[PDB]
Design a protein around this nucleic acid. Structure first.
Lengths: 56, 53
DNA sequence: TTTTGCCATGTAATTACCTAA
DNA sequence: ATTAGGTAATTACATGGCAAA
């Protein structure tokens, strides 16, 4: 699976979503994937890493 | 589809340690003639079943 | 009882995704 | 993002019961 740089608009929307809830449901992750032009697995791993860093 | 003998030994093991160590997973796989993935999944399913008691 | 046959229950495997390194 | 060890829900289908002619 290729690494990818997220455009600032993508990170903005992801942090916006993460600010409300650090956990993403499957249906919402699909909606976001389609809205941001991002693979679901990228959104899923982003959230996973984000939660781990916020824990430090 | 596990045998009566495989299931008895897996149960005996589970009773002693409900969590698999790498070495125990290896031993069981060898002695019972099963793949380590099957030993792993059996223990995971078992813990989930016991949790429904 | 035999024996057919059908559904409910059990379970191995799969899917999905979490934390942690 | 990967690898690993776990839970939880679900799938896929094996099989135990039991009903009944």
């Amino acid at each position: 699976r290729p690494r990818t740089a997220f455009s600032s608009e993508q990170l903005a929307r992801l942090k916006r979503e993460f600010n409300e809830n650090r956990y993403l449901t499957e249906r919402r992750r699909q909606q976001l994937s389609s809205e941001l032009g991002l693979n679901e697995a990228q959104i899923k791993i982003w959230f996973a890493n984000k939660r781990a860093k916020i824990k430090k």
